[PDB]
Every structure is written in C-alpha cells, then in structure tokens.
Amino acid sequence: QSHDEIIDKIIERTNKITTSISHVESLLDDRLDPKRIRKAGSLRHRVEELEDPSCDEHEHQCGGDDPQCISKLFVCDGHNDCRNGEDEKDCTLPTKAGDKFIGDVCFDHCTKRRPEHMTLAFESSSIAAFFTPIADLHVHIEIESETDEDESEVSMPADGEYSFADHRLTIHPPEEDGLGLVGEFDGYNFDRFVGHIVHELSEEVCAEFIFHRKK
Amino acid sequence: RFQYLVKNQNLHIDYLAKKLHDIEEEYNKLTHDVDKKTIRQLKARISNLEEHHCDEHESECRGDVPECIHDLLFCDGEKDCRDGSDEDPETCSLNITHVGSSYTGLATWTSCEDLNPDHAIVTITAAHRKSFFPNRVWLRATLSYELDEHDHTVSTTQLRGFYNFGKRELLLAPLKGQSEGYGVICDFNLGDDDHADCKIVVPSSLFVCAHFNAQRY
Amino acid sequence: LDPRLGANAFLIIRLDRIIEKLRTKLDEAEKIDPEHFVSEIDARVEKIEGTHCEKRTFQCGGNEQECISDLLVCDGHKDCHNAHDEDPDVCDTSVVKAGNVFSGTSTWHGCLAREDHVTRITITASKRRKFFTARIWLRALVESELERHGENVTSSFNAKGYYNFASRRLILLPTDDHDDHLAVVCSFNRGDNERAECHRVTEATLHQCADLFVTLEEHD
C-alpha cells in the first residue's frame, strides 16, 4: 500500500510549489505593470505645470534627474542633443487615422451654434519625411445641433499639426470666423485632452471642451 | 530503484521551495504598496492651487468634467448638472456631521487672548435635516480650548450653524449672551472626510482670529 | 521507466527556468518604487503650498503645526508639542557622514562664463559638539573636471561650512583662498537623502549663479 502512496505525495507537492512560484510572478508584475507608471506620470506633470516653467521661453525641459535645457526645435530632431538621450524616446506618434474624439462642453462664449457637444475625427496623419518634429493632420469636426426650428448639421474639414515638442496639437481655422482649436495633452496619457478654442488673432481663451477617445 | 528516483525528486524540489522562499524575503524587503488613502488626499492638495473658473458664491462639481453650479442646488432631489453629480452618495454622505463627531488640533492665536498654542476642539451636539429643504444640515456645537493659567482649564463657548454641502465647509457662530463670543469656519476641501483647515473668527467681520488645522479622533 | 514520475520531471525543468525569469525582473523592482515617489511629490507640493511659518524658522507639521525657532530644532529637548522636532526622520543625524560623495553637472548663467561641465563635492570632515548639538560643522573638497584647452585641467579647493537640521541645507565657503573659487550652497528639499539642488553663490549678496543638481554617488 505504501508503494504508489509515496509517489502521489510528490506530484502533490510539485503543484503546491508552482502555486507558490506562479503566485509571486504575477504579484510581482503588479509593481511593474505599465499602467501604474502611466497614470502616476500624469499626476507628476500636473504639479510641474502648476509651478512656473524652469526653462526659458521657447526652450524645452528634457531633464529626468539632471535638468538640461534645450531649444524647442530639437525634440524628435532625428539625433541626440539632450545629453540624457531623453528627447529621442518619444518619436512614436500617438494619434492614428480612424481615431475619433468626442468632447463635452465646459463653458462657451464663442457662439456660432453653442453646441451641447462636438466630435472630432482623423482623416489621415502624415509625416514630412526629412524633418519631423511636426506631423500634419486632416480632421473633420462634426457638430450635431438642435433648436426651435431645424435639426441642423455640420462637418467642416480643416488641417492641423501635432507637435512632439510641447505635445500641443493645433487646428487652423476651419471657417473664416478665425477660431483655432488648441489641443494640449499632458504628455503621458493620450486618452483625453483639455483642449479649448482661441480667437486665432488675439490669443484669448474663449470656450473649453474635455475630449475623450472612444473605445 | 524507483525508491531512488522518488528520493531524487524530494530533494530537487526542496532546493526550490528553499529558493522561492528566499525570494519571498527579497520581495517583502522592498517597499509597501502605499495605501489608496495617501494618494487620495495628495491629489486634493494640488486641486486647491490650480485655479477655478468657478467664482465665489458657487461650487464646482465633483466628477470628470468641471461645471460651476450655484450652492443651493446640491442634495436637492433634482439633477442640475450635466452628469447629475448632485444625486450621488459621494456627496450626500452625512459621515461628517453625524452627532458626536469632534475635531481637534492645537491653535495658534494671532488676534486675541495671546494664550500660547494649546489644544482646541470642536464638537457637534445635535443635527437636524428638514425633510422639505434638504440643501443644508442645521446643527449645534460646542467649541472648547485650553486657557493656560495654572491648572488645566478650559473656557467653553456654545454654538449653532449650518453645514453647506457645496463649499463642504461647516460654519458656526456664538449663540447669544455667551462669554467671549467667537465663531468657527471649517473647510473640508481635502480629499477625505477628516482633517480640515479651520479658523476661529469674530462673528461680524469674518476676520481671522485664530487658525488651527484640525483632525479627527 | 515508470510513468507519472517521468512527467513530473519536465515540470521541474520548466519550474527551474521560471525561477530565473523572476531574478531578471526582480532587479526591475526598486527601479521604480512607489513609496519613494509619493515622497518626491508630497515634498515638492509642500513648497508651493507655502510654509505658514515666517523667515527661517522650523515648521512642524501633522495634526498640528506652528513655528519654532531654528536653534531649538534638534537640541535633545521637547520644543514642539507633539515632538516632531526631536524625531529620527527629521534629526536623521547623517546625510553628511564623512566619505559620502556628490556629483553632477552645472550650467553657468552668471559670472565666470565658460562651457557646461561636471563638478563633484566630497565631504571630508564632520563634528558635533555634544553641548550645542543643533548644527554639524564640516569640511569638504570641490572638484572641477572642465576642459579649458590643450588638456583636461582640474581645479580644486577646500571648504568649510555647516549643515542645518531645520532647513536641511548645507553651505560651503572656501577657506584661505586668495583665488576666486565661488562658494556652493545645497538643499535637500526632496524629502529623500540622495538627490539635491544646489547653486554656487557669491559670498556677500547671496544672489544666485550656476544652478547645478547632484546625486549621491553609490556607497560600497
């Protein structure tokens, strides 16, 4: 009876060890999870924006642990300028064709149709091959209004550019009314941006929207 | 012979149950998981500096998309926002004015009495919420702070006032015919429902008599 | 020969390989640790929030807070009500224990205009008179690896100075130096004891120049 009763108490332990190992390999991946670094990164940037900028004017701050101040035109330049090497890591563009963002209103004083909420889509991104800090875009802007009378519509096409430098995207006025839309990401997130409209001539904040990516 | 090959397993496993159990220490000799509670109330300390488009006499909403809504429309029983933040128990929760709660933290006096920093507590003796006007929680309190003479002694004001769900700030006042008439303003704008930044004030000017950053036990 | 045992073998070989993959991604722990990070923010916010205290005096913080004059901070006597001043995490005698070495680069936007280069301060001496325990008198040596031209020429000088517990900032002035040698001033505002913000200053006006950051070179 002891034969076969001894071998059964081996395979039983073999399992009971692979638990104790495959528990700790997953429970370790918690601290290494990619989303943690992402989400906490966002918080880091929001406190630095609240402080004054440590750089000078058009310069950009690359420093991770040892600040190095470099001009704006060298981010994703194509070669190493920041002595960290931290300005070349970011050249992957975040917004791919077919991506569709929908904002909700925050407050609106630039009143064309004073919409409830408006939509934004990407026809096509494109990269000028040779010099690529800036990568131009085609974007629709859909707005589905409603009033007393009419169920009017709109979709004006425009063309902006996304800048790897300060992470802003721009939309050059779609109509002659001269309303530029100034996107601003935090830099670590890319599911939402707080971008808001501006009179292209005067550089004045008029109306904000909080966009989200749709999934 | 199968007994040999069996004994070869037992050993070869037990060298791994020793090797994992060795890593178990090196994993647990790194940092704790930093409980949700500190990051909860860190994000707040930022949110009190980034400026609000919302002006005075109104309170921004709690949710994803900040709006700016007038202060008499919270906990109303009608949704007045975009998302209807005003109906959710992340706001209606009364945990803060349940009777018997008490705040504390030693006070510095700038304006009166110059007593030298000594403990000061606020306490809530009785709370009522009227069924027909749920916007405010009417309540009564007793402020108490340690005069420093010889023996440990305390003067005890007595108070009444309302708790405003908008500002999140309860505010009290001296009753009438009470010695040394003071009032107290507690703002719970930090993350959790505990801690505060209070201030004892003179009831007329809202001039800041004594400032004490108070906790709860 | 006999089944069940033959299978059990292969489990042990796989399992032996998956215990190594842990050791590869074990060193990636400690690379980014949360408990250290929240300290970095909470301390950095704790400046722009503003010290309620006024003009070089130690601010307690916690349940309660109020001023105490910088000269009582770590004295071996209770001075604050809740004893935040006599604690280990604030006293923490040694961030300047001798032998520690700090290094890092320095831009120069002030006088003595030259190219951007690397510097490294190293603490030599330390003293603490057990009657007046409140400050740490200490010596140190300052190194410059700049390349002027035609060679790599290395400046050096000795510097005395002290280190507050209240303000957590050490200050070094050059001694017996007829030559220029502009003084250095640090601060450990990070809440952690590795990194530090410094800038070299003229001894009199105390206005800034040459903002440089430094890191604690690895012990052992």
Side-chain angles (χ1 to χ4, degrees), chain A residues 2-4 6-7 9-44 46-47 49-56 60-85 87-98 100-103 105-109 111-122 124-146 148 152-167 169-199 202-214, chain B residues 1 3-14 16-19 21-28 30-49 51-66 68-70 72-86 88-112 114-117 119-127 129-134 136-145 147-168 170-186 188-192 194-196 198-204 206-214 216-217, chain C residues 1-29 31-41 43-45 47-48 50-53 55-58 60-69 71-85 87-88 90-126 128-138 140-147 149-150 152-175 180-193 195-202 204-210 212-219:
Chain A
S2 284
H3 292 292
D4 308 353
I6 57 174
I7 66 174
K9 306 301 182 182
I10 296 168
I11 194 166
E12 187 186 356
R13 293 180 69 247
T14 305
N15 293 349
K16 195 182 168 182
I17 297 308
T18 55
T19 173
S20 180
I21 293 170
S22 285
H23 185 65
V24 79
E25 69 181 322
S26 183
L27 189 136
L28 181 69
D29 188 63
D30 180 18
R31 292 170 61 90
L32 267 57
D33 180 78
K35 188 189 63 54
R36 296 299 301 279
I37 290 166
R38 176 185 298 171
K39 181 184 288 178
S42 178
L43 191 148
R44 180 196 288 275
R46 193 178 55 193
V47 81
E49 183 173 10
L50 190 136
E51 288 182 343
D52 55 340
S54 299
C55 54
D56 297 346
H60 163 60
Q61 183 62 258
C62 184
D65 67 333
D66 49 357
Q68 181 65 80
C69 192
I70 288 93
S71 164
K72 194 173 72 176
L73 297 169
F74 303 156
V75 173
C76 302
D77 47 13
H79 58 283
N80 286 270
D81 300 17
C82 307
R83 65 180 185 76
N84 183 332
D87 72 319
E88 298 315 308
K89 185 56 169 64
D90 204 52
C91 58
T92 305
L93 182 65
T95 50
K96 186 181 286 182
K100 189 181 72 181
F101 297 111
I102 275 88
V105 65
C106 189
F107 58 98
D108 52 342
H109 305 153
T111 60
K112 49 183 185 292
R113 295 178 178 78
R114 60 179 188 282
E116 290 175 1
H117 62 274
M118 58 184 278
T119 296
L120 190 152
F122 296 144
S124 55
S125 94
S126 297
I127 291 97
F130 61 97
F131 171 79
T132 177
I134 310 300
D136 64 340
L137 294 174
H138 291 162
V139 299
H140 299 162
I141 288 178
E142 297 179 11
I143 299 168
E144 179 173 356
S145 178
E146 198 273 342
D148 56 352
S152 82
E153 297 302 320
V154 177
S155 172
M156 58 199 86
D159 55 338
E161 79 291 357
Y162 172 71
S163 91
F164 293 101
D166 36 353
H167 293 80
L169 76 77
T170 297
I171 300 300
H172 296 164
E175 194 166 17
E176 74 275 19
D177 203 9
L179 277 68
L181 181 142
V182 180
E184 182 174 343
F185 293 90
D186 63 43
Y188 299 128
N189 203 349
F190 307 103
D191 75 338
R192 75 188 280 285
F193 57 97
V194 302
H196 50 277
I197 71 163
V198 181
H199 297 161
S202 192
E203 188 67 28
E204 295 181 349
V205 176
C206 179
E208 292 213 327
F209 295 92
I210 299 303
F211 296 106
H212 290 293
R213 184 191 285 278
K214 279 198 70 67
Chain B
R1 184 189 183 79
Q3 292 180 336
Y4 164 78
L5 190 61
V6 158
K7 183 59 172 173
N8 188 28
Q9 298 303 317
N10 286 329
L11 266 61
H12 195 186
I13 278 172
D14 191 56
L16 272 57
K18 181 182 73 182
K19 187 62 184 299
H21 184 204
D22 173 85
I23 294 171
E24 193 61 25
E25 289 180 355
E26 191 65 5
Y27 178 75
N28 295 346
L30 290 177
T31 58
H32 188 54
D33 194 50
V34 67
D35 59 339
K36 186 175 176 290
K37 302 304 293 182
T38 52
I39 292 101
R40 183 59 180 164
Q41 80 164 25
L42 176 61
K43 290 182 72 70
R45 275 207 293 288
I46 284 102
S47 189
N48 304 136
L49 300 178
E51 294 182 356
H52 294 161
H53 181 68
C54 190
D55 64 11
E56 296 298 328
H57 188 44
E58 290 187 326
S59 295
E60 77 296 359
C61 304
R62 304 178 163 284
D64 197 354
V65 44
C68 55
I69 278 78
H70 177 68
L72 294 172
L73 278 65
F74 289 174
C75 304
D76 41 345
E78 292 92 3
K79 297 179 177 177
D80 307 318
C81 292
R82 298 287 181 275
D83 78 322
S85 66
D86 312 349
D88 197 67
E90 288 181 350
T91 303
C92 299
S93 66
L94 298 173
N95 267 347
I96 189 164
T97 76
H98 172 212
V99 168
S101 297
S102 302
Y103 305 111
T104 299
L106 72 71
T108 300
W109 299 78
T110 59
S111 180
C112 296
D114 62 36
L115 299 169
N116 187 340
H119 293 101
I121 67 96
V122 179
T123 178
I124 299 294
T125 60
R129 187 185 182 178
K130 300 305 295 178
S131 74
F132 64 85
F133 181 61
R136 297 305 174 80
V137 174
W138 298 98
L139 46 74
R140 282 196 197 151
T142 60
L143 188 143
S144 290
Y145 59 104
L147 294 175
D148 283 340
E149 297 295 327
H150 184 278
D151 49 339
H152 294 84
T153 312
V154 52
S155 177
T156 295
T157 319
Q158 189 167 338
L159 306 171
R160 68 188 180 79
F162 65 86
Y163 167 61
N164 186 352
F165 293 106
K167 298 299 189 298
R168 294 276 290 177
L170 66 89
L171 68 87
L172 303 172
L175 197 150
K176 186 184 169 62
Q178 291 299 102
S179 285
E180 199 170 8
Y182 290 144
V184 54
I185 308 294
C186 300
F188 289 71
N189 67 349
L190 275 65
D192 194 339
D194 76 28
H195 315 168
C198 309
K199 49 181 70 178
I200 297 112
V201 296
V202 59
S204 298
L206 303 175
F207 177 77
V208 291
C209 199
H211 181 283
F212 69 98
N213 173 331
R216 170 173 186 166
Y217 288 104
Chain C
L1 296 173
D2 184 1
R4 292 173 296 180
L5 265 60
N8 196 321
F10 293 100
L11 297 178
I12 305 304
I13 294 103
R14 285 180 188 176
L15 188 59
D16 202 10
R17 183 184 62 196
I18 201 63
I19 217 75
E20 182 184 7
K21 284 175 58 183
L22 294 187
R23 301 301 296 275
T24 306
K25 73 174 71 176
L26 183 67
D27 284 353
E28 292 308 308
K31 183 56 169 62
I32 294 168
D33 51 335
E35 188 168 358
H36 179 278
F37 171 85
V38 166
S39 184
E40 187 275 326
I41 297 298
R44 188 173 184 173
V45 165
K47 188 184 71 66
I48 298 95
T51 58
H52 300 292
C53 297
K55 276 61 180 178
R56 63 175 183 77
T57 187
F58 179 76
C60 299
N63 181 347
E64 65 271 8
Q65 61 186 30
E66 79 295 356
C67 303
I68 291 179
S69 185
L71 276 69
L72 305 186
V73 56
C74 171
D75 50 355
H77 302 276
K78 293 177 62 57
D79 306 295
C80 176
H81 190 278
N82 65 339
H84 181 213
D85 72 307
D87 287 345
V90 174
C91 174
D92 191 348
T93 63
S94 54
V95 191
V96 304
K97 186 177 287 179
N100 285 268
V101 174
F102 300 111
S103 52
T105 64
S106 59
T107 203
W108 289 85
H109 61 276
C111 72
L112 200 143
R114 61 188 179 184
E115 192 172 11
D116 185 351
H117 69 86
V118 59
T119 293
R120 60 179 184 179
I121 296 104
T122 177
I123 285 168
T124 290
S126 178
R128 203 143 171 249
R129 293 182 183 174
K130 72 183 175 292
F131 61 84
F132 172 80
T133 204
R135 283 181 173 66
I136 307 300
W137 293 89
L138 64 88
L141 186 145
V142 174
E143 191 76 351
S144 296
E145 299 173 0
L146 70 92
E147 63 189 9
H149 56 74
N152 289 343
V153 177
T154 294
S155 157
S156 175
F157 64 97
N158 290 339
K160 289 179 182 177
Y162 64 98
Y163 167 73
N164 271 283
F165 292 110
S167 203
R168 295 174 61 75
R169 51 193 295 277
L170 77 86
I171 301 157
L172 303 179
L173 282 68
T175 57
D180 41 337
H181 298 292
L182 198 62
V184 305
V185 171
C186 310
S187 157
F188 303 157
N189 71 7
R190 190 64 63 187
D192 188 77
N193 302 109
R195 295 196 293 281
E197 296 84 355
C198 311
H199 44 281
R200 299 174 67 95
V201 295
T202 58
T205 58
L206 186 62
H207 72 72
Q208 72 288 357
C209 183
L212 68 86
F213 297 84
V214 293
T215 307
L216 179 58
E217 187 63 22
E218 188 59 35
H219 287 164

